[PDB]
Structure 1
Amino acid sequence: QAENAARLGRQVLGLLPPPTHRVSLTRGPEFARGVRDLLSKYAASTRPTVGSLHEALRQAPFRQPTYGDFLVYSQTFSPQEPLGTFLFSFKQEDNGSSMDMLLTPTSLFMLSGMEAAKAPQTHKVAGVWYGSGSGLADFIPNLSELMDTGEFHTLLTPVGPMVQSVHSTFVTKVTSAMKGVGLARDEPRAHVGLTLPCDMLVDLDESCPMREPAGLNVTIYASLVYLRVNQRPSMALTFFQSGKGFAEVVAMIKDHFTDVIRTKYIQLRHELYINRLVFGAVCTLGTVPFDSHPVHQSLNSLPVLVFANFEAACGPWTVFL
């Protein structure tokens, strides 16, 4: 039975942070032999083999993300998910000991209440994960007034993708990911990527070409737009995929939402409320490495993109207009 305990002697002492490089001076120049991962040009031969390069593969960078542990009502977080969705932590007031509220982008489409033609795919899918929209509106009574003065983009803190979720009847545990690549729980040695519905994502770089430079980086941006439909305030969340840098995309997002700016601001020739002037916000959901192909999927149908090698790095909310 100690052979099972001898396994934890191997794995725990094998998996540690690397210790500090500290060698006493009386030993001499032995410390230069203790520097291996800074060496990055390994010698090759006529016929190289793994036994020639098993030392070369042994140095690897130090990557460990920081997880988030959320305790959620089983009503808000729909019990079946594709295990890689994006999340949000909505926060109003600590009323309970530990109860937390989490919003998938299919769920935030239900609290929005926009027309069907803006997102013609997810409206059927998000209509069967939930009720008619009052199952989630009972928890936030201020959804009329949080849209008027425009405080809703100040109450969302972007979290990242899922990792694990153990589901019970009343209480659902959600294990999320921050800082980067979350380790997959059920499949060993796998990595959970970030999945978006194809309807919500709006690509930005698209050309005939009719040339743009390459890079290492492309940054997914979140967006959230205050608007009015049926003379009732409602929100609209879209995503962006671009590597243009922050100085361009703010001008590019204005060209996407041109009509939404125009149809709203016809109203304020009559009534000019300073609380109404706030329009939208843009966060930074973290970087994606270049030339990774987003792979289409199909779920139930619902087409869902996927991003391998996603890493998360949350940012502030800045008010664009």
Structure 2
Amino acid sequence: ENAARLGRQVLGLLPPPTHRVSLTRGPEFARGVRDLLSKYAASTRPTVGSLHEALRQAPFRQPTYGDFLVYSQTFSPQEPLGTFLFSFKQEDNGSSMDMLLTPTSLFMLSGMEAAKAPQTHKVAGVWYGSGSGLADFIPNLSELMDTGEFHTLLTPVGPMVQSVHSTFVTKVTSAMKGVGLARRAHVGLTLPCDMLVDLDESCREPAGLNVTIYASLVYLRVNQRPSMALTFFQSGKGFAEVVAMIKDHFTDVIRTKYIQLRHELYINRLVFGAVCTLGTVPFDSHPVHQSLNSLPVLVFANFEAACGPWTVFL
């Protein structure tokens, strides 16, 4: 009996069969074309059964999940689901490990100032008691920021789907393409309001089909030491505008950077930033403000992930 219940569930999720109209016989052509036209006419009327038949045509592509394996002190158990994930792959470890950097954990490596980030500085300290367990695993947090090679090592991955945290080894599953299904709900990418800088706000541009989210990683000096600052942007203005709009955002940084480079010139010092292409939110799906424990976090919906190479801007 219980094996027959599964026979009704598999045979109710099958794809619809393709119509086989025989073009060689006389009456068999007439009765096969008639069942195309007795069936399109019952998929056009606004009745409920016609709408009941209309969704079995499912041309869905699928998310491709990546199973990572991180140390538990470089990745908090208190991470919001939908956090963006990077991968730092400087060398070949002796064991099969990986270093995944969330944008609140990359705030502790960078050391960018809390005047820029007032709320994600209190959060990044209460999860990371010293900030040393991150910085001990990167021996070049000064030579990768001087030469400008830190953005060449990060690969963007996608939002987080599952976090099985343990004492020493944390299993992290991401969604590298498509909309990530939880492990069942659809996990949208969650960014803090502290990092995301909109470009579509203004005082009539086209309502396009799509709007993209970029990731800028910007080299700068603080305390006369090399540091950096990672911000997120969101617009659908095409690639030529946004690179010209990000240069307007960092006008105050470049003018305070080359006061020191007017003294001395190294060719390791000229490269400044890099813009990635993370993914595409659909148009006018507004993000919903949430709070954590009070952390303003924009969670999107239907965020499918992409992957762009880091292109330099200056």
Q: TM above 0.5, one fold?
A: yes
Moved more, 214-223 or 9-18: 9-18
Q: Rg: which structure is higher?
A: 2
- Change in Cα spacing, 1:29 to 1:165, as seen in structure 2 (3 Å) is farther
Change in CA separation of 1:134 and 1:212 when aligned onto 2, cut-off 3 Å: same
State the distance in 2 between where 1:37 and 1:173 align.
52
Shift of 1:54: 1.7
Asked whether the equivalents of residues 85 and 194 of structure 1 are also in contact (C-alpha less than 8 Å), the reply is yes
Task: Write out per-residue CA displacement over residues 38-88 of structure 1, whole angstroms, 9 at most, x where no aligned residue.
Answer: 999965799833223322122122221100000110010111211110010
Give the deviation of 1:184 after TM superposition.
1.5
State whether residues 181 and 192 of structure 1, in contact with CA within 8 Å, keep that contact through their aligned partners in structure 2: yes
- C-alpha change, 1:37 and 1:43, in structure 2 (3 Å) is closer
Contact 1:227–1:264 (8 Å) recurs in 2: yes
Q: Distance in 1 between matches of 2:17 and 2:225?
A: 59
User: Which structure 2 segments of 5+ residues have no match?
Assistant: none
Give the Cα separation in 2 of the matches to 1:38 and 1:221: 47
User: Cα RMSD over matched residues?
Assistant: 3.6
1:110-148 Cα offsets, whole Å, 9 max, x none, are 001122101111000111110232121000011011101
Structure 1 residues 275, 89: closer, same or farther in 2, change over 3 A? same
The alpha-carbon distance between structure 1 residues 270 and 49, as it changes in their structure 2 partners (threshold 3 A), is same
Contact 1:36 1:59 in 2 (8 A): no
Q: CA deviation at 1:4?
A: 6.5
Asked if 1:286 corresponds to 2:284, the answer is: no
Q: TM-score, normalised by structure 1?
A: 0.87
127-136 vs 28-37, greater mean Cα deviation: 28-37
Deviation at 1:205, TM superposition (A): 1.4
Q: For residues 131 and 244 of structure 1, do their structure 2 counterparts lie closer, same or farther at Cα, with a shift above 3 Å needed?
A: same
Matched with 2:164 is: 166
Query: Which 5+ residue runs of structure 1 have no aligned equivalent?
Result: none
2:269, 2:34 → 1: CA distance?
A: 59
Q: 1:151 to 1:46 in 2, by over 3 A?
A: closer
> Percentage identity across aligned positions?
100
Which of the numbers 105, 110, 113 marks the counterpart of 1:112? 110
TM-score, normalising length: structure 2: 0.89
Q: In structure 1, the residue corresponding to 2:227 is in which secondary structure? A: strand
Alpha-carbon distance between aligned partners in 2 of 1:277 and 1:262, rounded to the nearest angstrom: 13
- For 1:282 and 1:22, the matched residues in 2 are separated by 51
Aligned length: 314
Taking structure 1 as reference, are residues 202 and 55 closer, same or farther at Cα in structure 2, changes over 3 Å only? same
